Design a binder for this molecule. Structure first.
Ligand SMILES: Nc1ncnc2c1ncn2[C@@H]1O[C@H](COP(=O)(O)OP(=O)(O)OP(=O)(O)O)[C@@H](O)[C@H]1O
Ligand SMILES: [Mg+2]
Ligand SMILES: [Mg+2]
Ligand SMILES: [Mg+2]
Length: 316
C-alpha cells in the first residue's frame, strides 16, 4: 500500500467526482472506474438516455433496456413500495417541472402541479423479465432515477475496483463516500459527517469506518428561492411540494451505497423522529440527523462512535 494514492478527479453528473486507489500498481484502475461511471451516467440521466427512451414511449409501447437499467429500476420499485410511495421513481413529471438545482428552476403554478400528480404511481411501471422491457402504463409518465443513481454508480465503481483486486480506496461522488479497506497506517478511515449548512466538504464531526458507504443529503445545497420562500429538491409525490419538516440534513451509514441513497430520500418524508424509527428497522443501517436548529441525533448503531466537533451544533 502507498501512503500517497493514485488520484483522479472529473466533473460528472453535475458534481466533482474523485477516485483514490492506494494499491501499488493499480493506477490504470482509475480510468476503468471513471469509464464505468460515464457508462452508467449516460444510461440513466435525464439531463437521449435509456430512461429518456422509456419516458418517450409512456402509454405507447414497452422499451428494451440494458441489464444495468433494468436492475436499477427493479430496485427503485422496491424503495418506492417500502416507503409507501413517498419515494417514487415515477416522480419525473414533477421533478422535471420544478427542475430544482438547474439554472431554469421554477416554482410552477398549482394548475401545473395538479396536472402531474395523477401521473405519479410506481405501480404503473410494468416490467417484463423475459423481454427485459420497461413500460409506463399511462401517457405523460416519466421515470426519474436521480435519488438512487449516485449510490448505484458508487456500488458499481466498487465492483470494478474489486474485480481488479483493489483493496484500499476512496470513492467520492460529490461528498457521498465509500471507504474501502483501512487507512494505509492501519487505522479505520476517519469519515467526515457533512455540515448541511455549509458547502460539500465542510463537516460537523467524524466517524471511523471501514468497508462502508456514508452518503449525505441536505436541504440547503441547491434550493430555489423566490419571493422570500425556499424550495429544496426532495419533493413529496403526494402534494407536489418539497417535504416540510424538521430535517436540515441526514447522513446514512450502510454497507451498500444504493441503500443509503434510497433510504435517505425515503426518510425525508418522516421527519427526524419518524425517520429515526424507520432506520431502526433496517439491520446494518444507521443515521445521523441534523435539525434546522442545529440539533444532532444518532441512531442506536452509532452511539459512542460519532464524534461531534462543530461547537455550533449540539447532540440531542
Ligand atoms: N420523493 C422522491 N422520490 C424519488 N426521487 C426523487 C424524490 N424527490 C426528488 N427526487 C429526485 O432525486 C434527485 C436526487 O435526490 P436525493 O434525495 O438523492 O439528493 P441528495 O442525496 O440530497 O443530493 P446528492 O445526490 O447531490 O448528494 C432529485 O434531484 C430528484 O430528481
Ligand atoms: Mg442522491
Ligand atoms: Mg446524497
Ligand atoms: Mg437519495
Amino acid at each position: 500500500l502507498m501512503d500517497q494514492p493514485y488520484s483522479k478527479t472529473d466533473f460528472l453528473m453535475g458534481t466533482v467526482v474523485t477516485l483514490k486507489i492506494y494499491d501499488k500498481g493499480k493506477e490504470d484502475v482509475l480510468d476503468k472506474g471513471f469509464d464505468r461511471i460515464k457508462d452508467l451516467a449516460a444510461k440513466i440521466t435525464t439531463s437521449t438516455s435509456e430512461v429518456d427512451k422509456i419516458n418517450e414511449q409512456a402509454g405507447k409501447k414497452p422499451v428494451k433496456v440494458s441489464e444495468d437499467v433494468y436492475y436499477l429500476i427493479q430496485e427503485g420499485l422496491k424503495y418506492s413500495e417500502n416507503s409507501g410511495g413517498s419515494f417514487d421513481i415515477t416522480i419525473g413529471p414533477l421533478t422535471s417541472l420544478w427542475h430544482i438545482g438547474f439554472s431554469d428552476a421554477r416554482k410552477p403554478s398549482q394548475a401545473e402541479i395538479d396536472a402531474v400528480l395523477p401521473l405519479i404511481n410506481y405501480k404503473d411501471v410494468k416490467m417484463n423479465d423475459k423481454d427485459q422491457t420497461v413500460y409506463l402504463e399511462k401517457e405523460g409518465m416519466e421515470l426519474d432515477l436521480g435519488a438512487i443513481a449516485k449510490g448505484f454508480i458508487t456500488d458499481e465503481t466498487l465492483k470494478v475496483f474489486k474485480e481488479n483486486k483493489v483493496t484500499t480506496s476512496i470513492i467520492d461522488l460529490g461528498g457521498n463516500i465509500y471507504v474501502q479497506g483501512n487507512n494505509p497506517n492501519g487505522n479505520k478511515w476517519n469519515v467526515g459527517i457533512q455540515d448541511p449548512f455549509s458547502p460539500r466538504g465542510s463537516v460537523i464531526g467524524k466517524l471511523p469506518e471501514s468497508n462502508m458507504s456514508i452518503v449525505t443529503s441536505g436541504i440547503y445545497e441547491r434550493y430555489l428561492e423566490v419571493d422570500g420562500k425556499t424550495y429544496h429538491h426532495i419533493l413529496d409525490p403526494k402534494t407536489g411540494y418539497p417535504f416540510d419538516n424538521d430535517i436540515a440534513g441526514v447522513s446514512i451509514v450502510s454497507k451498500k451505497s444504493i441503500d443509503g441513497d434510497g433510504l435517505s430520500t425515503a426518510t425525508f418524508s418522516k421527519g427526524i423522529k419518524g425517520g429515526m424509527d424507520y432506520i431502526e428497522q433496517f439491520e446494518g443501517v444507521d443515521a445521523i440527523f441534523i435539525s434546522k436548529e442545529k440539533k444532532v441525533y444518532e441512531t442506536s448503531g452509532l452511539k459512542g462512535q460519532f464524534e461531534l466537533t462543530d461547537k455550533d451544533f449540539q447532540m440531542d
